[PDB]
A paper describes a structure:
The AAA+ ATPase valosin-containing protein (VCP)/p97, known as cdc48 in Saccharomyces cerevisiae, is an essential and highly conserved protein involved in numerous cellular functions, such as regulating protein homeostasis, endolysosomal trafficking, membrane remodeling, chromatin regulation, autophagy, Golgi formation, and others. Its core function is to unfold ubiquitylated proteins in an ATP dependent fashion. Previous studies have established that post-mitotic Golgi reassembly requires presence of VCP, as well as two adapter proteins, VCPIP138, and p4734,35. VCPIP1, also known as VCIP135, is part of the ovarian tumor protease (OTU) family of DUBs, an essential family of enzymes that remove ubiquitin tags from proteins to regulate protein homeostasis and function.
Interestingly, we also identified a region on VCPIP1 that engages VCP at its C-terminal domain (D2 domain), which we named “VCP interacting domain” (VCPID) after validating its functional relevance. The observed stoichiometry between VCP and the VCPID domain of VCPIP1 is 2:1 with each VCPID contacting two D2 domains (D2 chain 1 and D2 chain 2). The VCPIP1 VCPID interacts with the dimer through its alpha helices, while the β-hairpin loop connects to the VCPIP1 stalk region. This interface is further stabilized by a salt bridge formed between VCP K754 (D2 Chain 2) and VCPID E641. The three VCPIDs interact exclusively with VCP and make no inter-domain contacts. We observed variable quality of density for the VCPIDs, more specifically the β-hairpin loops, suggesting that there is compositional and/or conformational heterogeneity in the binding region.
Author numbering:
A (entry chain H): 589 to 612, 616 to 657
B (entry chain A): 198 to 430, 436 to 588, 594 to 718, 724 to 774
C (entry chain F): 198 to 430, 436 to 588, 593 to 718, 724 to 774
The structure:
């Protein structure tokens, strides 16, 4: 569970949380799932959150890339 | 008997009735009109895509009414040399005067009098002015009605649309499913048709055809049958009568046909009914109040001194039947339905063509009562990021809504998945003031949606659509349609594979029944393995929060009255 | 015998068949058609790049059917003084009516009746109106078919495309490889070609050549041979009979070709096949279901009441055979394949010429069944940053055209995108590229197939074990394998040229043969593999595989049990 911080900036609110990453079978982390979970947890029922999810996915991909 | 009559006109029953009302009394009873001091119609302007039989409409009206029909052809007049064209126009109008009551039909008017900018040469402008003068002098001419045919109202010189000149305008437009069926029956009368063909089916299939396209399609089917029979053999009549056109020929023609009106906006009464989208009885009542009542009971609105609401705005998850609801309400009131998809709004935005919005409303005004539907009012807002909230296209929509007379029974119905980014200026009173939440379908609504989707698809009785709807909680209408289409796809694949296996068996054994004549229950079982919920609980959550925010401000419920 | 005939015309077999079916009955059986009472074709508008022998098609049809053929040349009519041109047109139509059945060919129609805006003089509009009047007056004329040739359908006055006018339309278009071969055979009939020439090779090598271009190429080869003979040396024919053009002459002519239709949109059935890209069995099945079934078994879809899917969207790492898969499925159904590269979409975007999208679809509609392929649907999205939304003018026009295309026509849109995320969501809705197919990196079998396909045209020593090369090239895209093959070929060519130079230099220094490298050997592939690069890192395939795993995880709701 590699932990790295990511900052959700949306609706004028900043919320920095650590993402756990299961890089290593079939339980490996999925950005399109962890980002959705993050936005739902911190910005539930928020319009236009898909672009925030895309931003989070990009950031997590950059962090995970070695 | 070959002289054209109303029997030979199809696909424009409403417009044909309008033209008949305009031109019956002035022509059937001309002397009566001259006795009374009542202004008759002078210039009628039939406009619509070419090949809709506008000339046929004029000729049929003239023949049935008995008036002398004089045909002026735009290209014919413009082909003549300078002076000869004006002389021809003068002679045509003089002939109509002599043999009154008469109908002068100017075909392809835009050829004679296009937009003033397009008129470059001096002779063209002189011809247009001569036509205008002839129209102005068309007062003491024994009720000589002049009808003209053009593509669009703006395609001709605006000076021709002034009073006294062409003033009454009829929008022939595109035939609808029933209209296409009528046209097919008219054009297939002489052709011997086998019982295989069912003209209503092709009429449903022949979307985008104008009537000349339908005539071409019928001719193509007849020629396909004749080609099929040609190898076997002034021409003997018994064989011709024996010759019959099969539904295979019509399907082949459909495949080879090139519709000429796939771009024209579709104005027609939608076939969608409330059954196709069950449930939402509260929204059904709301839509009824907004649309049906002001058109069915104008007296009540006048008596209570209320202005009918100009429109409403649907908001909810994508693919929940907003378009279905709009079409259903349009069908209930038998009012024409205009769909303006999000791509159209974005096209107007990108090309700076927001002026076209006016045209849209004009069209909606012509087909009154109408339900003008904007599928995605947030398209431009989304394209800009989702700067201020105002954009050129939505601003033009607001302008037209403000300029829309409430007496014309044109009701705007917006739709959006992002009600937050909708420009607030459109939700003010006198605009799409009311907001209606279209939630995900409930169990009854899901059952109705499944039944509607599986209406043209033979399905086994073992399928319990009630149970399927019960197990698909949270699925949108789009998801249910996806499940039905996937089940049909699995059935088609099974049928293809079984046919291939049987053919291969015959190949290896040259020495029957449908392997899968119905969409069996296992097909739905498999399709449910490719079924997703396109609307997650978060989307429902955000829509519910929006609705709750709207409703919370709507307090003051506990009002008293001593 | 010198008169033109169907044999004399090649490269447009499909369009020629369409013209045959349109015009044979009204012309072969005039009185019978009149007795039928059905409207025959009146205006047939052949359009396509110039030099494709449209007038040849018209003359061949007239000669084979015996219908009197009258030729009207646009420039010839316009050259005449004012009024004289109208008299010429009237006389032409009257003469054609006299010798009914007949065909009136208005060559270079746009010269007579261009778009109204292009016309400026009064006499130009007058002559256009005269032509329209005559076309409308064809009704009273018996068994007179008017054929017209124009570069593009939008090059002539729209008033000429109404009903009773040039309504029937036929896109001759540039010939394909088979069509080019047919044209070459037609134009090489009299030439006593040497046995060395294989017209198939040139037909493949003559991409972008119209029929007139191929005729000019054959003439140039003949002139090269005649030049050689004259340099060696009212005219005897035995030398001409013995004069033989060779592949040397044809290649020299190819060098001096200047094709006239290099920029024309190529529409043809691709030669690619599933074997060219092995594996991808699931994707092959899905593509078959989407394309072959609706085009080969319409009856099944009608019986089960489904609308065939309008298109699909491929997503995956670059250069994994998305184009190969699209071409393979197009070839499976023998459907025309139209590819719109990312540069084309970007050109439409930069120039604000999104209207051209309509033309593209029209082209596809004219080639039904067709497989419209968009090589990079995300090119515009990438060019915008990768602070507006996802919507853009070009993709919006693509959506508008996709919505407004009838499903009866078998035009299927296959989109390809290396970035499934950034593609505009509106394109993935039902009635659009709803299905998303993941094209992963080639597996071992697909790698073997790709290597075999790439090395098909190369003389490869049988010692090389392509199975081994594919085995340990795991993670290599199709582009990487193609690069390996090309680099091995480059090494082999360099070795061949170096050995030849050494041989000639040795002869020079030792005045006092065999091919040093007749085939690509194992050492060449080893050296090439020393240059091999993985164009797709583990992280990119991570992104794609994870997107697919997301689309599949949410595709749950299984365990369904109907009773």
């Amino acid at each position: 569970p590699e932990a790295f911080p990511i900052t959700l900036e949306w609706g004028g609110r900043v919320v920095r949380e650590t993402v756990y990453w299961f890089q290593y079978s079939s339980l490996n982390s999925n950005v399109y799932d962890v980002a959705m979970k993050l936005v739902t947890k911190h910005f539930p029922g928020e319009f236009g959150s898909e672009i925030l999810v895309q931003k989070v996915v990009h950031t997590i991909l950059h962090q995970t890339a070695k | 008997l070959n002289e054209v009559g109303y029997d030979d006109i199809g696909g424009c029953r409403k417009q044909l009735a309008q033209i008949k009302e305009m031109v019956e009394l002035p022509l059937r009873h001309p002397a009566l009109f001259k006795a009374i001091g009542v202004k008759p119609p002078r210039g009628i302007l039939l406009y619509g895509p070419p090949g809709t039989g506008k000339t046929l409409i004029a000729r049929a009206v003239a023949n049935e009414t008995g008036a002398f029909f004089f045909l002026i052809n735009g290209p014919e007049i413009m082909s003549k040399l300078a002076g000869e064209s004006e002389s021809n126009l003068r002679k045509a109008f003089e002939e109509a005067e002599k043999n009154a009551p008469a109908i002068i039909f100017i075909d392809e008017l835009d050829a004679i009098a296009p937009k003033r900018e397009k008129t470059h040469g001096e002779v063209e402008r002189r011809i247009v002015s001569q036509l205008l003068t002839l129209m102005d002098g068309l007062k003491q001419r024994a009720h000589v009605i002049v009808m003209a045919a053009t593509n669009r109202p703006n395609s001709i010189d605006p000076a021709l649309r002034r009073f006294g000149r062409f003033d009454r305008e009829v929008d022939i437009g595109i035939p609808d499913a029933t209209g296409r069926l009528e046209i097919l029956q008219i054009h297939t009368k002489n052709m011997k048709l086998a019982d295989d063909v069912d003209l209503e089916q092709v009429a449903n299939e022949t979307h985008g055809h104008v009537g000349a396209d339908l005539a071409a399609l019928c001719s193509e089917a007849a020629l396909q049958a004749i080609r099929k029979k040609m190898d076997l053999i002034t021409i003997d009549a018994e064989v011709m009568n024996s010759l019959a056109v099969t539904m295979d020929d019509f399907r082949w023609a459909l495949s080879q046909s090139n519709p000429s009106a796939l771009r024209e906006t579709v104005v027609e009464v939608p076939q969608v009914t409330w059954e196709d989208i069950g449930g939402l009885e509260d929204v059904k009542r709301e839509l009824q109040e907004l649309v049906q009542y002001p058109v069915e009971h104008p007296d009540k609105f006048l008596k209570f001194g209320m202005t009918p609401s100009k429109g409403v705005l649907f908001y909810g998850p994508p693919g929940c039947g907003k378009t279905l609801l709009a079409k259903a309400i349009a069908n209930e009131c038998q009012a024409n339905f205009i769909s303006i998809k999000g791509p159209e709004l974005l096209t107007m935005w990108f090309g700076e063509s927001e002026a076209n919005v006016r045209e849209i409303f004009d069209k909606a005004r012509q087909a009154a009562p109408c339900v003008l539907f904007f599928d995605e009012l947030d398209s431009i807002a989304k394209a800009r990021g989702g700067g201020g909230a105002a954009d050129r296209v939505i601003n033009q929509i607001l302008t037209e809504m403000d300029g829309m007379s409430t007496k014309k029974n044109v009701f705007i119905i917006g739709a959006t998945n992002r009600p937050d980014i909708i420009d607030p200026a459109i939700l003010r009173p006198g605009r799409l003031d009311q907001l209606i939440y279209i939630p995900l379908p409930d169990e009854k609504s899901r059952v109705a949606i499944l039944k509607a989707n599986l209406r043209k698809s033979p399905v086994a009785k073992d399928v319990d659509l009630e149970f399927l709807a019960k197990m698909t909680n949270g699925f949108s209408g789009a998801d249910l349609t996806e499940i039905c289409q996937r089940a049909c796809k699995l059935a088609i694949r099974e049928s293809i594979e079984s046919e291939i296996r049987r053919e291969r068996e015959r190949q290896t054994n040259p020495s029957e029944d449908d392997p899968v004549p119905e969409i069996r229950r296992d097909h739905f079982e498999e399709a449910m393995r490719f079924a997703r919920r396109s609307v997650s609980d978060n989307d429902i959550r955000k829509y519910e929060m929006f609705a709750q925010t709207l409703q919370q401000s709507r307090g003051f419920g506990s009002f008293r009255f001593p």
